[PDB]
């Protein structure tokens, strides 16, 4: 066995030889080996999976260099190792796929005249892991991302990358703990890489290209699936809610809502004071490039507001936070709630109303933003309360009709969901999608 050095958490900690962390707006290695980290002028910091993350744009000043300490300098020459990091890449437009689809550029590398070592690179919608030994011998894992960009890994969402290397067998590439690619690597000689690990866009012809990298980490062993699962989920801090992209959910920000259980649906409004329902979102398809996705940014815009002042006006929404949900329609904001004795399906599934204002009729609008299930998904649940603080249920949808309107999946609040929180798919899970430069519909 060529690994180094029991409890999984202990193994993960002990086998870590490099761990980039960001505190006090400074990037440093907290592995204990103290490899020095050189941050260049245009390396930017942006919201991360748990704190801030490294943001790299396409210019010479945007880079972070890690100078390996002598104690780990030659750790991957003959022995096993694993590289892990959260990664976020913008969805590549149809135009850029045609124009730059064949341009392979590295983003993380240990390769310097022959360039032995390893590298993480991107080519169009392909994520590539490369190992090169001192003889120029090469081994690669090429991962072709899913055609459906709504579910793809290189389409603007934070995803967790993990690449294990067993010198006696093969290299395996994982995304969110799932095996996506592999390549036998036996027959490789010594790996003589550069003294530095460089995080930078190298040889990228698209000047507007950028990537985000977080928690860059290296282990001195080839992690097994169980360890990778624990590693991955260890970053999903359940106290802070996240938006569709994996970034922190924020107050006073416009979001489009999409039900996780019917991701091809957008939310629409019947009329002010009335109900909301689902409609099919338009879609984009390109046979030539073999890509497609339900288009985003259509439907109602929702805004989350603090029910009462939080900590120190923190901009991020915490699980357990009480809020007021509003719909921003024609520049006017209307609160979402359930009026006393309001129409409901079989007196159990309370039909939500937007901007309801019948005089003398109490409107229950106090909600709680929570994370009760599906840790790996960037979704949120919303619990509505009445005036006595009793639960009116979780926001979801119910199929049926109102008056003579067509059959529709109508937005409601129901306690029914609390008895099915273990289901794989549940109608009370919601994606909060904010407009982002990393995703423009073609």
Swiss-Prot record:
Tree of life domain: Bacteria
Signal peptide: none
Disulfide bridges in this chain: 204-220
Protein's name according to its UniProt entry: Tetanus toxin heavy chain
Organism of derivation: Clostridium tetani (strain Massachusetts / E88)
């Amino acid at each position: 066995n060529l690994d180094c050095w029991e409890d999984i958490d202990v193994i993960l900690k002990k086998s870590t030889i490099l761990n980039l962390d960001i505190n006090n707006d400074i990037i440093s290695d907290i592995s204990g080996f103290n490899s020095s980290v050189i941050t260049y002028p245009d390396a930017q910091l942006v919201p991360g999976i748990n704190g801030k993350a490294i943001h790299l744009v396409n210019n010479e000043s945007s880079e972070v260099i890690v100078h390996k300490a002598m104690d780990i300098e030659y750790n991957d020459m003959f022995n096993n190792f694993t590289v892990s990091f959260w990664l976020r890449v913008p969805k590549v437009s149809a135009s850029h796929l045609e124009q730059y689809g064949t341009n392979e550029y590295s983003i993380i590398s240990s390769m310097k005249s022959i360039g032995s070592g390893w590298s993480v690179s991107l080519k169009g919608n392909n994520l590539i892991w490369t190992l090169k030994d001192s003889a120029g011998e090469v081994r690669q894992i090429t991962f072709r991302d899913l055609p459906d960009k709504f579910n793809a890994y290189l389409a603007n969402k934070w995803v967790f990358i993990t690449i294990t290397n067993d010198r006696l067998s093969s290299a395996n590439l994982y995304i969110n703990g799932v095996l996506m690619g592999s390549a036998e690597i036996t027959g490789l000689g010594a790996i003589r890489e550069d003294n530095n690990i460089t995080l930078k866009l190298d040889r990228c012809n698209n000047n507007n290209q950028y990537v985000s990298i977080d928690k860059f980490r290296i282990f001195c062993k080839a992690l097994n699936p169980k360890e990778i699962e624990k590693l991955y989920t260890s970053y999903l801090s359940i106290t802070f809610l996240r938006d569709f992209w994996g970034n922190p959910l924020r107050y006073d920000t416009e979001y489009y809502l999409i039900p996780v259980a019917s991701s091809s649906k957008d939310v629409q409004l019947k009329n002010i004071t009335d109900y909301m329902y689902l409609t099919n979102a338009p879609s984009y398809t390109n046979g030539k490039l073999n890509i497609y996705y339900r288009r985003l940014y259509n439907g109602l815009k929702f805004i989350i507001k603090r029910y009462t002042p939080n900590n120190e006006i923190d901009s991020f929404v915490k699980s357990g936070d009480f809020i007021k949900l509003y719909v921003s329609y024609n520049n006017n904001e209307h609160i979402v709630g359930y009026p006393k004795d309001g129409n409901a399906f079989n007196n159990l599934d309370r039909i939500l109303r937007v901007g309801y204002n019948a005089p003398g009729i109490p409107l229950y609008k106090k909600m709680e933003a929570v994370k009760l299930r599906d840790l790996k998904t960037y979704s949120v649940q919303l619990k509505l309360y009445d005036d006595k603080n009793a639960s009116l249920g979780l926001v979801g949808t119910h199929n049926g009709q109102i008056g003579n309107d067509p059959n529709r999946d109508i937005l409601i609040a129901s306690n029914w969901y609390f008895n099915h929180l273990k289901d794989k798919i549940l109608g009370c899970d919601w994606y909060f999608v904010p407009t982002d430069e990393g995703w423009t519909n073609d």
